[PDB]
Amino acid sequence: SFSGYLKLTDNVYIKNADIVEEAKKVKPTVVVNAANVYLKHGGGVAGALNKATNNAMQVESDDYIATNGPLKVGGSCVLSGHNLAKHCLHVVGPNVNKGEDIQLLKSAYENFNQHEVLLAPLLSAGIFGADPIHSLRVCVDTVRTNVYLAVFDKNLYDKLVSSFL
Numbered sequence: 001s002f003s004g005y006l007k008l009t010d011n012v013y014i015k016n017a018d019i020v021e022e023a024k025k026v027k028p029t030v031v032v033n034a035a036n037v038y039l040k041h042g043g044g045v046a047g048a049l050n051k052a053t054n055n056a057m058q059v060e061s062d063d064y065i066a067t068n069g070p071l072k073v074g075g076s077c078v079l080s081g082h083n084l085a086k087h088c089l090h091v092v093g094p095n096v097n098k099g100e101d102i103q104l105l106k107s108a109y110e111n112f113n114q115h116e117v118l119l120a121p122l123l124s125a126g127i128f129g130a131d132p133i134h135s136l137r138v139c140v141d142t143v144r145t146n147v148y149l150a151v152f153d154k155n156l157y158d159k160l161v162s163s164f165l
């Protein structure tokens with residue numbers, strides 16, 4: 001199962017890890033992607049997860065959007081986890097860099113409650129522009145299921161742990 005995680009709360013765990021490397025090692029039931037509404041996995045966590053699937057995630061995602069249209073900001077969809085996980089839960093956190101409502105971050109984290117255990121990044125962090133300290137706070141105050149957070153950046157991981165209330 002998951003190893004080397006620091007326990008933050010009853011159900012939230014954290015580790016300084018590359019989520020792609022973590023997914024390839026654990027092969028969890030669910031890996032969360034930091035998706036956008038179009039499921040265009042160009043960069044950040046999404047670009048990295050998609051590249052690890054040899055673009056199979058993007059081919060599947062394009063078929064999903066052709067059938068269903070875009071997701072909502074704060075919404076999600078369950079697709080294949082390919083070589084990374086049984087499933088990928090594509091969750092759209094608000095992109096502050098595109099002027100989206102930060103208040104939608106709680107709605108985005110609520111999607112995690114439909115899964116007993118997840119490997120996930122901090123939603124709306126990184127290239128999505130939100131404060132990762134705030135994202136972690138919303139995560140611990142919203143997610144009730146078991147969430148294993150992978151934080152790519154060591155310096156950010158240390159800041160998140162050392163500032164955790």
Ligand SMILES: CCCC(=O)NCc1nc2ccccc2[nH]1
Pocket residue numbers: 018019020021043044045048049051052126152
């Ligand atoms: C082959 C190793 C995996 C890989 O593609 N690393 C690049 C990378 N990992 C990230 C994690 C979070 C956000 C952006 C990331 N970019």
